[PDB]
Q: What sequence folds into this?
């Protein structure tokens, strides 16, 4: 199965069951080592999409919370006020 | 502010004016209804603390227009590492005796989670600084809120464009501004916000602290590095009130 060189970006393949394992270089992550550090969905790349805060040192994936007076939205990234005057929005241009 | 523009009434809702018996003393940043951030050196030479007032919703000091909201400063909390007369740790958390009422002209600036401030807010090229301080190094203070947009610099570049005995930029500070003698914060603006916008929200990143004169060719302006005081500030706001008018809270 390691014959079709599935491990991208100089990954090291190893046959497992009727499939394989890709052991990726430092800088790459994924099943097939397909994504680079600078393209990953971690907090250092553009605040991983999050409008306000971000976290990613707890393993599996990245989360995106908000600051008091704001709540997360559907998409898991955007944020919206939950009070009249949330911190740091200029009401007169918020209405304009 | 030197070379700034008048902040259109309503566009600097966290701006705070600090008075001492009617006299202008410094600026401040509203961070909550009873809490304003400002700078420790503003309190270096104060004899009377009952006449210390914060004014919010202010804009034109020569006319009363009813959006002004005043509250007596009940307490000033400064880092225990601050030393009067020297510039390091120039920050202060002031407690208002009675809350202000958030209004269209009165809103707090967000006090950002530290890690966001260091990973993202610190790379945003420009930021606003504002105040009623001198409009020139030995010039008149403003009558109307002035605001300025200044680009941030890494400390290693702060003196590259330039008195050996001027204050040293420490890790509790950062540089921002222009080196051509055109634009900078100046005396009287201390404590005003250095605010940074990120995806529609404005966050507190620095405090006007000091500089070599104001807009001195060759130099930039120095601001307090709020990211190092986040936890410090948070913990003082979430704790129980402490008696006293001037408090040296442990730092960190
Ligand atoms: C800003 O720092 C400079 C020099 O920086 C070095 O200062 C040494 C005293 C030492 O602490 C070392 O950690 C440091 O990084 C200051 O100038 C120095 O001033 C001292 C006396 O205050 C003199 O003994 C030195 O000859 C002089 N050296 C240099 C290179 O200038 C300067 O005092 C300081 N600014 C302020 C306001 O303190
Ligand atoms: C308290 C203020 O309103 C004010 C703001 C000035 C900001 N300047 C510029 N260019 N943005 N700050 C000061 O006046 C401070 C006072 C001070 C600050 C911290 C601790 C103690 C006192 N002083 C200055 O800014 C001095 N000109 C700094 C200085 C520069 C070079 C040599 C000696 C002192
Ligand atoms: C070749 O490698 C495996 C063979 O098991 C295949 O599943 C991959 O999709 C291919 O690139
Ligand atoms: C597997 O083998 C070689 C080719 C190296 O690139 C290794 O680091 C990799 O894990
Ligand atoms: Ca007024």
A:
């Amino acid at each position: 199965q390691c014959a079709s060189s599935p491990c991208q970006n100089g990954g090291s393949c190893k046959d497992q069951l009727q499939s394989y394992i890709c052991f990726c270089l430092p800088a790459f992550e994924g099943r097939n080592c397909e994504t680079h550090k600078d393209d990953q969905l971690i907090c250092v790349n553009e605040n991983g999409g999050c409008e306000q805060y971000c976290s990613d040192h707890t393993g599996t994936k990245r989360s995106c919370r908000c600051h008091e007076g704001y709540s997360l939205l559907a998409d898991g990234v955007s944020c919206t006020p939950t009070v009249e005057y949330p911190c740091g929005k200029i009401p007169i241009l918020e209405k304009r | 502010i030197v070379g700034g523009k008048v902040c259109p009434k309503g566009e600097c809702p966290w701006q705070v004016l600090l008075l001492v018996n009617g006299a202008q003393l410094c600026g401040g940043t509203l961070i909550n209804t009873i809490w304003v951030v400002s700078a420790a050196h503003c309190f270096d030479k104060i004899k009377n603390w009952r006449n210390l007032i914060a004014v919010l919703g202010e804009h034109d000091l020569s006319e009363h227009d009813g959006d002004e909201q005043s509250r007596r400063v009940a307490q000033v909390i400064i880092p225990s590492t601050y030393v009067p007369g020297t510039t390091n740790h120039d920050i202060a958390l002031l407690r208002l005796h009675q809350p202000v009422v958030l209004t269209d002209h009165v809103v707090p600036l967000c006090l950002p989670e530290r890690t966001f401030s260091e990973r993202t807010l610190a790379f945003v090229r420009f930021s606003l600084v504002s105040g009623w301080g001198q409009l020139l190094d030995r010039g008149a203070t403003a009558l109307e809120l002035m605001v300025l947009n200044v680009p941030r610099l890494m400390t290693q570049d702060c003196l590259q464009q330039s008195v050996g005995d001027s204050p040293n930029i420490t890790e509790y500070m950062f540089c921002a501004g222009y080196s051509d003698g055109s634009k900078d914060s100046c005396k009287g603006d201390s404590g005003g916000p250095h605010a940074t916008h990120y995806r529609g929200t404005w966050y507190l990143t620095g405090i006007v602290s000091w500089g070599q004169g104001c807009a001195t060719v060759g130099h930039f302006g120095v601001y307090t590095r709020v990211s190092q005081y986040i936890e410090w500030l948070q913990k003082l706001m979430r704790s129980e009130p402490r008696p006293g008018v001037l408090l040296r809270a442990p730092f960190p």
In short: The domain at 13-108+228-241 of chain B is CATH 2.40.10.10 (Thrombin, subunit H). Chain B touches chain A through 26 residues (CB under 8 Å).
